[PDB]
Design a protein around this nucleic acid. Structure first.
Lengths: 98, 180, 48, 154, 41, 128, 138, 58
RNA sequence: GUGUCUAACACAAGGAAGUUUAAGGCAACAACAGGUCUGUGAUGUCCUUAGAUGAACUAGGCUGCACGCGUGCUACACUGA
RNA sequence: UGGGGAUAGAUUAUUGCAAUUAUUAAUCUUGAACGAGGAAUGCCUAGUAAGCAUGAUUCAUCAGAUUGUGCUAACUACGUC
């Protein structure tokens, strides 16, 4: 199960939730794998008319990706996923296991 | 013990100005088996003293335009120059180089008045003078920069007025004396 | 009319329709003068 | 210069023990002696890359280049022609404008690659990207490495 | 200047001075004697 | 004896054979290198010790590319306009022909011809 | 068995693997002999003199290099060898011999015991350098 | 010609209008005061080509 | 060590690092009749609004060239090509 | 001078309806000034300065620009009004 967010705290909250969630059905998990951070970087000139000293500022939209995976039957993981969700994080389910 | 390029013994001392002996790489920890270690040599006021004089000599050689960043080449030029000095006379080139640096350092300098000169500055100026003279000799002439440096060093060590460093030192001191 | 499918007239700032200073990086399609207003609500933050 | 004393142990059988240039020239000379390799014809006339404009000025350069490619093959296993073009890259003086990178000529590389393959020293597999080495070629490179290693040693 | 013709310590510049010749001609004399940069020691 | 002269009375002779040839025409040096190879002379050799026959061969190769393995993309004066092909005009004949081309352009009227007549750069000197 | 260390100057990182052995020194797939520049050849020969042959002769060293150019990589390798030599004598041989060895290394230089402190300063608008600026005019 | 090694006794102060000079007291026996260019501290040794006139105290 | 021997400073040692560790970001008070209505369905007033200063479409022009001043690039070689 | 690549001719390509004010690209040839810059004046103190590159931005078509990023790794005080 892959978790992608732009918010650190929300992704970490989901981490604690999934750890509890896994232990509820006593599942066999591989520890949460944090994938390389992608930052959407815009280096932006200050001034709408391009005045004065040139002056650039660097804006960052930093997205966090993490993956936690489970060896368990298909029904169990989808049902676990549906109880575990919150609106902000992007969830992908890739488990075909048994 | 420690020998430069695994060759030059460089344990022998030179009398010099005493202060100059303190400045040059007489010390065991300033000695190295082949040039270049590059510690942080700007940090404190006297920190430059602690630099190996061969590291300083190569850095001076590395100066100026096309030469910048060619540290290995500056090492090759000095190594070649040491071979040339050894041929010209069977003396240890490093000892000869210390003699040239000792000779080249100005005793007084001129100001808006006239002043004595730091021993660390005297070494820094001497190396600068010898390398600049070598470049002047090199540029648009037959002689290789290694030859020019060797030639300048031997002349300066000898105390020949044909040395660029000796000529400049003589002029600098003479003008300082002329004012005061 | 006679249309042109490429170059300057093929594109604009999505917000203001002006053809100048458009960020096409990451396919934003907003001119930076408009974008700096909205970059926070878009989710960007500056740090450097 | 040619040989210095050192205290550590070495492998003593591969290109990773060898002076690259000496090895490259020797194998090229051996290959030309054998006469497996051919220039051929048109390749006498050509240019080696627009970053140069010129050519190597040595008349045995193609064999040298072939040998040099074979060394790159021993280093890098499954490489292909675009990798070769990139490998042999240099800077190109753009006239008054600043430099930008420029590939070696791709036909000479392709011709060598094909010729080595025809002479059985490399094999394109269905697996992965391009050509890797044949064992007979590797054993020969090792034998030449051994000859040089003995030659320096004694 | 006049330091260039075909017919009549080890280091090429000295040879080029001594016989008044080019460094290419000096190198050729070095090669005949023996029978980048190089080591003359 | 040792510094014998070269094509159209040029006094080169302590120049290398390539360097002498380039000092005529061909000083992009690819032209000289291929001519040297077609001749099969040593490029390291000095010009004034070639015999006349070697020089004549070189002049023949430069003058007539047709019987040599020299491709059209390499050639001086590659297509030459009209349906009747001509190739490799070279030297003073190239200079003369180029003057004729500028005259022809001018008479027709082309922007480049017109700029040549004015005394203006084809690529333009740009304001200054 | 195995003991592990690394060295880190600028980008470059050289990880040293010191196993029980017989005097082999490698750099990735390549022998230590293939560093190539004569100056930098000496820079990695330096620790070999400081520990001599007979203390090298029961260990094999393999080194794994990523990042930087040659002068930085060689200094990272040299640091990795220094730390590597010490780690073997701390894990296998003796603390007292390790202290004696470290004293020798310290006497030669600090740079094969403690890595570089210099790291790049970002470019900022108004000039090609970090601090250097485009020319003012009147 | 004549010269004397003289041992720096006290570093007195930075002099010159732009501050680049330093006033320094030098010990034979006898104290002399002279003005020095570049990095210098107490226990250094001055070249002392001119062995006569004492620089004026600030 | 120095310092009312206070707030604090100086040197050496220890230490990965000893100035707030180095670099950024954020940037008051009060201005400027600085720039920007050609970024904006932010916008007053004024002109114009169908042989339209709108929309749209075809060329030419923005790099023109006796010439002057800014900013940059490339060179003037042999420590190089 | 085989430094230098201004300047020009002849090609086949590339993007596009359109390249013809050399669009851009390469191939061969063509081989200018310039012998290290006068009066003046810019930036810089530690991985900096300088050199050497390259990604990104505009982009159907294009880096000599800007903005980042690295490697090669200096000098000189180390302060003063």
């Amino acid at each position: 199960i892959a978790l992608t967010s732009k918010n650190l705290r929300a992704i970490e909250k989901v981490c604690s939730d999934i750890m509890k969630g896994a232990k509820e059905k006593n599942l066999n998990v591989s520890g949460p794998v944090r994938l390389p951070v992608k930052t959407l970087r815009i280096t932006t000139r200050k001034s709408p008319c391009g005045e004065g000293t040139n002056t650039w500022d660097r804006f960052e939209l930093r997205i966090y990706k993490r993956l936690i995976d489970l060896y368990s039957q298909c029904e169990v993981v989808t049902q676990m996923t549906s109880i575990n969700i919150d609106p902000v994080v992007e969830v992908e389910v890739i488990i075909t296991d048994s | 013990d420690i020998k430069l390029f695994k060759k030059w013994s460089y344990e022998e001392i030179n009398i010099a100005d005493l202060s100059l002996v303190d400045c040059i790489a007489v010390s065991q920890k300033a000695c190295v088996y082949t040039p270049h270690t590059a510690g942080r040599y700007q940090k404190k006021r006297f920190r430059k003293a602690l630099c190996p004089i061969v590291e300083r000599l190569v850095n001076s050689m590395m100066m100026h335009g096309r030469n910048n960043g060619k540290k290995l080449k500056a090492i090759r030029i000095v190594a070649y120059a040491f071979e040339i000095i050894h041929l010209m006379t069977g003396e240890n080139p490093l000892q000869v180089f210390v003699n040239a640096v000792q000779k080249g350092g100005p005793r007084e300098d001129s100001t808006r008045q006239a002043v004595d000169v730091s021993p660390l500055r005297r070494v820094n100026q001497a190396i600068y003078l010898i390398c600049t003279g070598a470049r002047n000799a090199a540029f648009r002439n037959i002689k290789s920069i290694s030859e020019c440096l060797a030639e300048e060093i031997i002349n300066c060590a000898n105390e020949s007025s044909s040395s660029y460093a000796i000529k400049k030192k003589d002029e600098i001191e003479r003008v300082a004396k002329a004012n005061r | 009319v006679h249309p042109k499918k490429y170059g300057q007239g093929s594109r604009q700032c999505r917000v203001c329709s002006n053809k100048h200073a458009i960020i096409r990086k990451y396919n934003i399609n907003i001119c930076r003068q408009c974008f700096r207003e909205r970059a926070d609500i878009i989710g960007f933050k500056k740090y450097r | 210069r040619l040989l210095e004393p050192v205290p550590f142990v070495k492998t003593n059988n591969c290109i990773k023990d060898v002076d690259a240039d000496l090895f490259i020239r020797s194998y090229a000379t051996h290959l030309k002696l054998h006469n497996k390799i051919t220039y051929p014809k048109w390749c006498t006339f050509v240019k080696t890359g627009k970053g140069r404009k010129l050519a190597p000025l040595n008349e045995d350069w193609y064999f040298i280049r072939a040998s040099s490619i074979l060394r790159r093959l021993y280093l890098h296993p499954d490489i292909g022609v675009g990798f070769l073009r990139r490998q042999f890259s240099s800077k190109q003086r753009r006239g008054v404008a600043p430099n930008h990178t420029s590939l070696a000529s791709g036909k000479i590389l392709r011709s060598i690659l094909q010729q080595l393959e025809n002479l059985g020293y490399v094999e394109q597999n269905p697996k992965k990207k391009g050509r890797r080495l044949t064992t007979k070629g590797e054993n020969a490179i090792n034998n030449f490495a051994r000859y040089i290693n003995k030659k320096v040693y004694n | 200047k006049l330091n260039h013709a075909v017919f009549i310590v080890i280091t090429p510049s000295a040879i080029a001075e001594k016989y008044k010749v080019n460094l290419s001609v000096a190198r050729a004399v070095i090669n005949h004697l023996a029978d980048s940069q190089k080591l003359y020691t | 004896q040792h510094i014998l002269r070269i094509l159209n009375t040029n006094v080169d002779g302590k120049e290398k054979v390539i360097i002498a040839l380039t000092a005529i025409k061909g000083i992009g040096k690819r032209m000289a290198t291929v001519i040297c190879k077609q001749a099969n002379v040593d490029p390291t050799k000095r010009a004034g010790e070639l015999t006349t026959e070697e020089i004549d061969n070189i002049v023949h190769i430069m003058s007539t590319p047709t019987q040599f393995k020299i491709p059209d993309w390499f050639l001086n004066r590659r297509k030459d306009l009209k349906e009747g092909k001509n190739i490799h005009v070279i030297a003073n004949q190239l200079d003369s022909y180029l003057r004729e081309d500028l005259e022809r352009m001018k008479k027709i009227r082309l922007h480049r011809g017109l700029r040549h007549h004015w005394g203006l750069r084809v690529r333009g000197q740009h304001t200054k | 068995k195995r003991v592990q260390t690394f060295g880190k100057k600028k980008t470059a990182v050289a990880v040293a693997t010191v196993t029980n052995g017989k005097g082999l020194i490698k750099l990735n797939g390549k022998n230590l002999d293939l560093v190539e520049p004569y100056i930098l050849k000496t820079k990695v020969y330096e620790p070999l003199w400081l520990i001599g042959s007979g203390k090298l002769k029961n260990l094999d060293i393999r080194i794994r290099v990523k990042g930087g150019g040659q002068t930085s990589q060689i200094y990272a390798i040299r640091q990795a060898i220094g730390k590597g030599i010490i780690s073997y004598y701390q894990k296998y041989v003796d603390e007292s011999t390790k202290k004696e060895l470290k004293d020798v290394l310290l006497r030669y230089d600090r740079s094969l015991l403690v890595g570089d402190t210099r790291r790049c300063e970002p470019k900022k608008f108004g000039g090609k350098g970090a601090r250097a600026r485009y020319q003012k005019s009147y | 010609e004549k010269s004397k090694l003289a041992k720096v006794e006290k570093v007195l102060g930075r002099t010159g209008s732009r501050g680049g000079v330093i006033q320094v007291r030098a010990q034979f026996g006898r104290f002399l005061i002279r003005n020095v260019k570049g990095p210098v501290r107490e226990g250094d040794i001055l070249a002392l080509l001119e062995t006569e006139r004492e620089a004026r105290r600030l």
